[PDB]
Amino acid sequence: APPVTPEVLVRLADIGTMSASETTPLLSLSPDGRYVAFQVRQADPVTNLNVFRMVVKATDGATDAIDVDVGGEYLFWTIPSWGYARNAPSGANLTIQPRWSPSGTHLAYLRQDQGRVRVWRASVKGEGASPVIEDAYDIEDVQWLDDNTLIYSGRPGFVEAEAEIEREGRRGWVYDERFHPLTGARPRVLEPISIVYQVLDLKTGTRRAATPTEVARLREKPDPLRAMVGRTTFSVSRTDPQNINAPTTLVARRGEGEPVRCDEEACQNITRMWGDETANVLYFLRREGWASNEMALYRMPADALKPVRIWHATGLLQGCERQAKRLICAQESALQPRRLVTLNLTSGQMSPLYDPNPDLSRYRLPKVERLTLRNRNGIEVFSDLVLPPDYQLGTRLPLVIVQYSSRGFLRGGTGDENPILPLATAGFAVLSFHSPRSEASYQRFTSPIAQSKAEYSNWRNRWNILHTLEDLIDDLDRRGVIDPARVGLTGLADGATTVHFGLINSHRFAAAVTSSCCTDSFTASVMNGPRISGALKAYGIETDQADDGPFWAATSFVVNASRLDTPLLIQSADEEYLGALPGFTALQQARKPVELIIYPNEHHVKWQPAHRLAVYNRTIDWFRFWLMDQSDPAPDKAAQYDRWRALRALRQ
């Protein structure tokens, strides 16, 4: 049975944005409940393109899925942040939620071609799709008002503001709060920029202004934490509404009556609920078990406050919507990539509905085992241990750590950068680390910004993270599973920070890979520009200290270059590389084994399939080289190993 290689992993299809959870709106049920519509994305590293398909599948399971549209460009998820109308893209794709017409015969949805987001309309038995709305601005959302009428939104003001920036540039721009140098040398558009609503009649091609009523049908979103059954409104609240770390509890109000709080433990920290008038019940989801490692679904007769658990598992259920007494969900788990599933709301039985991948038991899969421990600060931790398919007990393996969430399918860790199953296939033990809760998250805080400030104070939470990794390593060391002198560490985003912290404040790692650098004043103050730099200070990032200040000594590679002896590979997007340069240069000057790779037209999370594959392969090669002393003799890698042999020789 063939192995799971980087070539296999990069081609495993997906549904919705990279990191999806309970409320990710990645599917839509038809009005009568008989069909589910959703987008499938599949990456091709040879053509270096994602291929997108809009898919319709009967919820009864009896007929094959149908592609009702094929095509489009990778549409970035973007939002306003920091007072900018559009922050740099994280690189993640926007989840595309198809809108069914009231008749159930057509879909409307966003789709990008030639750099422009339009509304497309597709026939649901497969007969074709075409764009029906385009404007000077990207369309941001759409709904059906009736079978022939669409309302849609976007920001022509954003376009106009861009043209004003372009005019102003003729006189030079003052460097101020509009700039974010890391990502580009132009002023950004500042908020406020308004959203404009328009209505299109598809039968006449005419457009008109929306009415306030129509507008609210687009603007208002359902609260997934609120439901009605009869006269009873279910919601969730805290005994102390200000304290964000106080657990929420299910509450019931009959009409305008007093709220009644459910006392049961099961009613705490609900993530999703659904009311069913016919059955007169409330259903809800939540996380539970050690370190919240499992999901569970509850059924609660709406007369009372006695929830009963009907399903629980490791994994995730995402985007779930109800048809009668089934839930239709996306679902994933360690060895199951994202697929659609039906959950029986009486028995709690889960059945396959649609899997865009073949069955992976076709491949020789690594062995997975969920680890649990309480860390030295008393906090419950889980993580996943992945072992090579031919693992014989007694064998001490090199270890590679991938961060920092492990709830779902073991793909590439956060940002999909570090290939878990292929690493195991290559002979490594892999720890898929699920970063634990901070101490601060157990204390009273009125703002997530104030909590952050407590976590960064003296890098207290970063130490809790590092000590947790050291606990896990020590565990696997006692079990005789790993050689503790041969531990590799990877990170992207918050995991990158952990890598930087880890290489300076321990000697437990023999090799590392990061997607970005650095955690230093240059990156956080200078390259962010004055707006973001100033805003980060409230989060506990000391951007008013220069790099030789006390806060940065724990993480700056410029300050600590001369004692940083661990081999480090940085595989950066061009959009983040500038931040790495002072650090990189100090390391080279101090003759350390560091290498920086740059990828063009990329983001914080990488989107181009050829790039991802190349990242996967180099990261495997890197760990094989430093932790196994092995090199692949393929002649197109010879120059890479020349370079890495030279890095190795610097160490003496």
């Binding site: 944005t17 990279m18 990191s19 959870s21 998820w77 939002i79 942040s81 920091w82 922050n87 740099a88 994280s90 690189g91 993640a92 974010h180 890391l182 956060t414 940002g415 997530p448 952050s452 985003a493 918050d494 990158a496 920070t497 970005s516 955690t519 990156t523 956080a524 390259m527 962010n528 973001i532 980060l536 989060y539 990032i541 983040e576 931040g579 914080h604 999370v605």
Partner: peptide, 17 residues
């Protein structure tokens, strides 16, 4: 991180959760 909600994804202006 990929998902732009609550907390810091590193120190360069991206959000987590």
């Amino acid at each position: 991180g990929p998902t732009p909600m609550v907390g810091l994804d590193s120190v360069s202006g991206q959000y987590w959760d």
